Write a protein that binds this DNA or RNA. Structure first.
Lengths: 87, 135, 131, 61, 196, 50
RNA sequence: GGUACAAUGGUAUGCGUAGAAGUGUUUGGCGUAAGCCUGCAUGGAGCUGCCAUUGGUACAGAUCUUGGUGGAUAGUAGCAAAUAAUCGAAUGAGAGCCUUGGAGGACUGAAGUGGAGAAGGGUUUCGUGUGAACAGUGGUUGAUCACGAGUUAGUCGGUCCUAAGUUCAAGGCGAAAGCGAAAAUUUUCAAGUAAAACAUAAUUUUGAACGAAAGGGAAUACGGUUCCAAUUCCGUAACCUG
RNA sequence: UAAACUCCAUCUAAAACUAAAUAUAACCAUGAGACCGAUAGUAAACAAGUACCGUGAGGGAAAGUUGAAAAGAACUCUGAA
RNA sequence: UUAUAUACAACCUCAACUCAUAUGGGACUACCCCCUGAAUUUAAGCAUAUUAAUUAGGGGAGGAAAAGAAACUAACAAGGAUUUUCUUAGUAGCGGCGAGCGAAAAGAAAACAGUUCAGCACUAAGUCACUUUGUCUAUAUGGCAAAUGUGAGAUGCAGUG
RNA sequence: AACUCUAAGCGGUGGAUCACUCGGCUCAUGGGUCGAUGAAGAACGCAGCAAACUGUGCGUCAUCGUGUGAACUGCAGGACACAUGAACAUCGACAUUUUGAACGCAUAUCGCAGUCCAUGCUG
RNA sequence: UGCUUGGACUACAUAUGGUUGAGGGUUGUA
C-alpha cells in the first residue's frame, strides 16, 4: 500500500499561494516560498538554473515604468515642458 | 584564523581539502572590521580604519566614515570625490586602504600576477586565447 | 545605397511595411495622378482618399470609366471603387479591392489640407529639377 | 492639471516643494552631485589655472 | 570579406535529460525527464536525436581569413594586367570586344571628367564598348539558391573596368551603368581585375 | 470548500470567466488564425492547483 | 579516378506562367557502375551546364531519434464483483438503459446505497436548449456541449484567545548569505494617572507578533416562501453588544 | 641563492584622487551575412516559457502555407440530420 | 555647591522623539571589483599534482570598472605611472622533476595627464554648515548680501605647501 | 466476381518532397538610462459585442500636448466632433488599482488599530 | 458629543541640527 491506497490520503496542502510571486509554492509551516523565497527581502534565483531565471526576468511581465524611462532617455529626460505647436 | 564552516561531518574531498582548524582568512581583521560597518551603515561611506586596542580575543578599530549627502561634504571640493557613484561601498570592493592589501596590488616584479588589475583580471589575460583573423 | 542607415534586407523591408501603422499606410497607399493633373499641379503621385475619382488600369476591370472610391481599406492595402464590383453566390454586390498602384487618379478631392500637399509636392519639384 | 499647475505656482519661491512638484529624473541623477559643486574647485586649483594657460602654437620650420 | 557564422553554443543542451539505462526496453540515450507534455521522454542531446546538438557545432573561431604573401599578391596583380592586354584572353572571358580599337584601350584624361550617366554611355557607345554592357543586361537573372533568401537574389555579370588616375567626375557618372566599375591606378584590386 | 478565503474566491472567479469560448466574430476578422479556445479547462479533467 | 547534395566566385548574349523546382510513371534511352538525359501525366515560380573554391555533403542497421502505418484482429482479447427486472404508454428520425411518468417484481436494510457536514473540488448546482465529440453498448438524457441564472446574516462560522510551536527584535556570531540561532536580545528596553510636595512621585524588563473554520469564546427560534438560497429572505416572537 | 662584513646602484612603503587606449551572451537603437529554412534555426516563425506534468525545487511541448480576389459553393431534390 | 541638605552653572559620555531636513535596502546579467571554493577529469591505478587559485554560493558598482603617477627596472651608452595588443615564450622557472605547468624586464605598438594630503617659524580661525532677511531668475539639494542669529571648529578649520 | 500472388490505373490513409518566410542564429556599429519621487515582479479588474495575446488602471484595449491630415472595420453604432481635426504615430501633461525592497501590526485574514483633518446624521 | 464616509500620517538603520533629558562621569562661583 505504498501506491493507490496511500494516495487517497492527499487532502492537505503543503504549499498555498505566494504573496510576492503568486505561485502556489509558499510552504505554510516553513512560511517560506520555494520559488521567490518570499519573506526574505531578496528574490531567490540561482546560476545553476538559467531556465528558471529566464521565466521571471525583467520583461517577462509588463515593465510599466522601465520602458517609459527608455522613451524618456532618448529625449534627454525632459520634464515640465510640452510640445509647443507649429509645425 | 578561520575555522572552516564544514558541518563537523567535515570536508569531503581529497586529503588536501581536509584542513579545518589552522586556516586563515585572506582578508585581515582590519579588512573584515570596516566591512562590518559598511553593511550596517549603508547610508555612509567608509574612508579609512585604524587600530586602537586589542587583547587576546578582540582587536578593535576606529573607522572614519563620512556622511556623503551632507551639505558640507559635498560643497567642499577636497573631500568631495567620494560623493560620487564609483565610491558607493568602496570598502566592500577592496577600495579602502585595508581591503586593498588583500588583493596584492603593487609594482613590479614581486607583485606581478595581479598585473592587469585584479588577480582574476590577470588569470583572464594570461589564459586569454586570441584566435586572430590573420593567423 | 549610399546610406548606412538604410537596409537592403528583404526581411527588414517586408517586415517594415506589412507592419506599417495606418498612417505610414497612407503614403504606402499611393496612386499616380492623371497626365492632366500631373500637368496642372506638377505632382506625380498622391495618397488616395475617399471622395477621389479614379480609373482602374491593370487587372480585370481595366478601365475607361471613372468612379469614386468609398473605402481606403488600409488594413488590406486595397481600395474599393464605386462600381468596381462582383457578385456573391446569392446576388450581393461585393466591392473588389484594387491596390492603388494599379489605378489612376483623375479628380482629386480637395480641401484645405489636400490642396496644401499639392502646393508642397509641386513646389518641391521645381526645387528639385533646378539642381 | 488645472490644479497641479496651480500648486506649482504656490511652490514657486519656497525651498522644500512637495516630492511630486520636484523633477523625477532618475534616482541616480537626482543624487549625484548637482553640477554647481561637482565642478567647483579648490583655491589651489584656481591658482594653478590662472598663470599658465595652454598656449596655442604650431611647429615646423 | 567573409563573416562568421555559428550555431548557438547552448542549443541542443537546454534539457535536464539523463539516461534511463537498461533494462527498460528502450535505447540508452538521454531522454527528457518529467511528464505530461509530449516531450518526455523523448530523446535529447544527440546529433541523431530531434532537438539535440549538431555533430560538432560550428564555432566562430574557424580560420576564415587568410594571409597571402604580399609578393604573391603582386604576382597576381601583374598577371592580371598582362592578361588585360592580349585579346585572346579578354575574348575568352565573354567580353564583346570585336569593335574595340586597341589592346590596351587607352583613352584620354577627358574621360575622367564625365559627369552624367548620359555622357558616360555615349563614350561607351562611341568607343564601341556598349556591346559588352548590352551583354550585361542579358545576363541579369535571379540566383538559383537559397541566396535569394539571403540577400543575393541577383543582378548581372561583369563588364569593363575603367582604371583612372584622378576622379574629376567619372566614378559618379559610371556608377549607375550595370557591369561597369571604376578603379584607381595605385590601388588595383586583384579581386576586381581578375574576377572569379 | 464552502469555507474559502476571499483570495481563493477571486482566483476561482477569474478562472471561471476565462472559461468561455472564442466569440465567432473573432474568426471573421481579417487574416485570423484563432480557431478554438486553447485555454479551456474542464473541472473534471484538468485541475487548477489552488 | 569517377559519381550524388548544398553553397560562394566566375561563366554560359543559358532555361522558364507558350509551365521552373518537386512528384508520379509498361515513354525511349545512355552509362561496368554510382547516376544521367528524355517523353507524357500532375504541379504552379523559379532553376540548371561549365571553371574554381568549398561544406552541417551521400544511410538499412545504432533494443538509433521524431512521426506515420501494417498484421495480429472487427476477432476463442475482451466489455461476467456489488441478486433484477418485466408490462404497457407517451415522446422520437431512431428507445432495454440514463428519457419520462404508470403499474409491478426486487435490492440497500438502516454500522444504509438514507439524510447532512469537514478536508478537497470549483460552477460541477439550477432552468431551457441541444449537434458532432465524450458517457469503453445505445442515448431523445447527462457531472457533456450552447445559453440564461443562482450563493443574502449583529445571532451560523470566520474574525477575538492562547496551546504545541513559529517568525522577527542587537547579547551575539558568521566573509557573507544567514544562523536547518532562538535570539530572550537590549541606556530610562514595560505600566500608571477625577495625576502632586527639599526627585513631580508610588510600580514593573521573558521584548513583539503570529499559530485552533474540532480547544477557549457575547447573542435566535419557529412557521412560511424558490426553477435555483436560507438558524441569512418573509412573517412572527425574542436576544446580545455598544 | 641563505648568512656576515665593506661597498655600489636604486627607490621612498605602512594616506589619497585621476581622463584616454581596453572589456561587454545584458539593455536602448541599428546595419550585415559563402548562416538555418518549420524533425532545421532559439525550447519558442503560431494567443511560447504557452498548453500541460510535479507538493515543491523544477520539467516543458506540438502546432507556418485556400486563392490574385472569398468570388467561402445562391438555388433545387433526397434525408431527422 | 554636593551632612548627597536651597539652587546654580559649565563641560564630558549617553538617551529619547509621528522633531526639522535629508541618506540607505531591492532588480538586471554580458562585461567589472571584493570574497568563498569544489569534484568529475587527466596522471593509463592513486593520495601531492592536475582540473583550478575554475563550475556552484556570497557581497558591491559603473557605462565601463579595476589599476595608476614608483619603496619599479636594470647593471645600460641606461631607462621612467597605469591599462590593451604583438613579441619575449611554451622561455626562466616550478613539478610523484611525473602528468603537466609557466610569468616578467627590455624591445614594438594603441593611448597619453597629471596630482592631492598628514606632518614644519601659516605667523591674528586668516575656514565651514544651518537659519532668518534683503534680493537674483531654474520651476535653483541654486546666486549674492544682511543678522555675522544658532551651531561645527583650537582633541586643529581654511590658505601656502 | 472465394482467397491468394504480381503489375498498373482510380480512390483512400498519411503528410515526405519541393518552392515560400513580419522567425531564429552569427558578426559588427552607435549609445548609456531602474528603485523608498515605490523598481523589477505579482494579482485582480478594464472593451457595444472578447476568452487568450497585446494594451492599460476605477480617467481602466486608453491618455494631455504635438506630428501627420481621413479613417476605424468581424458587425453594429455613430463621425453635423477636417470646415477649428479621424486614425495613427509621437509623447514632454496629468494619471497609475491591490501588492511587491514594501514602510501602523498582521496576512492560508481583504483581520485589528492608533493619531489627525474634514464632511454626513444629535444639539 | 454621536456613528458613517473620505483624506493625511504611524516601519527600521543612519547623518547633521533642534528640542527635552539622564549621570555621587570629570569640575566650578557661591
Amino acid at each position: 500500500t505504498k501506491g493507490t491506497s496511500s494516495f487517497g490520503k492527499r487532502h492537505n496542502k503543503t504549499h498555498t499561494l505566494c504573496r510576492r510571486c503568486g505561485r502556489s509554492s509558499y510552504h505554510i509551516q516553513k512560511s517560506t516560498c520555494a520559488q521567490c523565497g518570499y519573506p526574505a527581502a531578496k528574490l531567490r534565483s540561482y546560476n545553476w538554473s538559467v531556465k528558471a531565471k529566464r521565466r521571471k526576468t525583467t520583461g517577462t511581465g509588463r515593465m510599466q515604468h522601465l520602458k517609459v524611462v527608455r522613451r524618456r532617455f532618448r529625449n534627454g529626460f525632459r520634464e515640465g515642458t510640452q510640445a509647443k505647436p507649429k509645425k | 584564523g578561520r575555522k572552516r564552516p564544514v558541518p563537523k561531518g567535515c570536508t569531503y574531498g581529497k586529503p588536501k581539502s581536509h584542513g579545518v582548524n589552522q586556516l586563515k582568512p585572506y582578508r585581515g581583521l582590519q579588512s573584515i572590521a570596516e566591512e562590518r560597518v559598511g553593511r550596517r551603515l549603508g547610508g555612509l561611506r567608509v574612508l579609512n580604519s585604524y587600530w586602537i586596542a586589542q587583547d587576546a580575543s578582540y582587536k578593535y578599530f576606529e573607522v572614519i566614515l563620512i556622511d556623503t549627502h551632507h551639505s558640507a561634504i559635498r560643497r567642499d571640493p577636497k573631500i568631495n570625490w567620494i560623493c560620487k557613484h564609483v565610491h558607493k561601498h568602496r570598502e566592500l570592493r577592496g577600495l579602502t586602504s585595508a581591503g586593498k592589501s588583500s588583493r596584492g596590488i603593487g609594482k613590479g616584479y614581486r607583485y606581478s600576477q595581479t598585473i592587469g588589475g585584479s588577480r582574476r583580471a590577470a588569470w583572464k589575460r594570461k589564459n586569454r586565447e586570441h584566435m586572430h583573423r590573420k593567423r | 545605397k549610399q546610406n548606412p542607415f538604410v537596409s537592403s534586407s528583404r526581411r527588414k523591408n517586408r517586415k517594415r511595411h506589412f507592419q506599417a501603422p495606418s498612417h505610414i499606410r497612407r503614403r504606402l497607399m499611393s496612386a499616380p495622378l492623371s497626365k492632366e493633373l500631373r500637368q496642372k499641379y506638377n505632382v506625380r503621385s498622391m495618397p488616395i482618399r475617399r471622395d477621389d475619382e479614379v480609373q482602374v488600369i491593370r487587372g480585370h476591370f481595366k478601365g475607361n470609366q471613372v468612379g469614386k472610391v468609398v473605402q481606403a481599406y488600409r488594413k488590406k492595402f486595397v481600395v474599393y471603387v464605386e462600381k468596381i464590383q462582383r457578385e456573391n453566390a446569392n446576388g450581393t454586390n461585393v466591392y473588389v479591392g484594387i491596390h492603388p498602384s494599379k489605378v489612376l487618379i483623375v479628380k482629386l478631392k480637395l480641401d484645405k489640407d489636400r490642396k496644401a500637399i499639392l502646393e508642397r509636392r509641386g513646389k518641391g519639384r521645381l526645387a528639385a529639377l533646378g539642381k | 492639471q488645472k490644479q497641479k499647475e496651480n500648486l506649482r505656482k504656490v511652490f514657486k519661491n519656497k525651498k522644500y516643494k512637495p516630492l511630486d512638484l520636484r523633477k523625477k529624473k532618475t534616482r541616480a541623477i537626482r543624487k549625484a552631485l548637482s553640477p554647481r559643486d561637482a565642478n567647483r574647485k579648490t583655491l589651489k586649483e584656481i591658482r594653478k589655472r590662472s598663470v599658465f594657460p595652454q598656449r596655442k602654437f604650431a611647429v615646423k620650420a | 570579406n567573409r563573416q562568421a557564422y555559428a550555431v548557438s553554443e547552448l542549443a541542443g543542451h537546454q534539457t535536464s535529460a539523463e539516461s534511463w539505462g537498461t533494462g527498460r526496453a528502450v535505447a540508452r540515450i538521454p531522454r527528457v525527464r518529467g511528464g505530461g507534455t509530449h516531450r518526455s521522454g523523448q530523446g535529447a542531446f544527440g546529433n541523431m536525436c530531434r532537438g539535440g546538438r549538431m555533430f560538432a557545432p560550428t564555432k566562430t573561431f574557424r580560420r576564415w581569413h587568410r594571409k597571402v604573401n604580399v609578393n604573391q599578391r603582386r604576382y597576381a596583380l601583374v598577371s592580371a594586367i598582362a592578361a588585360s592586354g592580349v585579346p585572346a584572353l579578354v575574348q575568352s572571358k565573354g567580353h564583346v570586344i570585336d569593335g574595340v580599337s586597341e589592346f590596351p584601350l587607352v583613352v584620354s584624361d577627358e574621360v575622367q571628367k564625365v559627369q552624367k550617366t548620359k555622357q558616360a554611355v555615349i563614350f561607351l557607345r562611341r568607343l564601341k564598348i556598349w556591346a559588352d554592357i548590352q551583354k550585361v543586361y542579358k545576363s541579369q537573372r535571379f540566383r538559383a539558391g537559397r541566396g535569394t533568401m539571403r540577400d543575393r537574389r541577383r543582378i548581372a555579370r561583369r563588364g569593363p573596368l575603367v582604371v583612372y588616375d584622378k576622379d574629376e567626375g567619372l566614378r559618379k557618372a559610371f556608377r549607375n551603368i550595370p557591369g561597369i566599375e571604376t578603379i584607381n591606378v595605385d590601388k588595383l584590386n586583384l579581386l576586381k581585375l581578375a574576377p572569379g | 470548500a464552502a469555507h474559502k478565503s476571499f483570495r481563493i474566491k477571486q482566483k476561482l472567479a477569474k478562472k471561471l470567466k476565462q472559461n468561455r469560448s472564442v466569440p465567432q466574430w473573432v474568426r471573421l476578422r481579417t487574416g485570423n488564425t484563432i480557431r478554438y479556445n486553447a485555454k479551456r479547462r474542464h473541472w473534471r479533467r484538468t485541475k487548477l492547483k489552488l
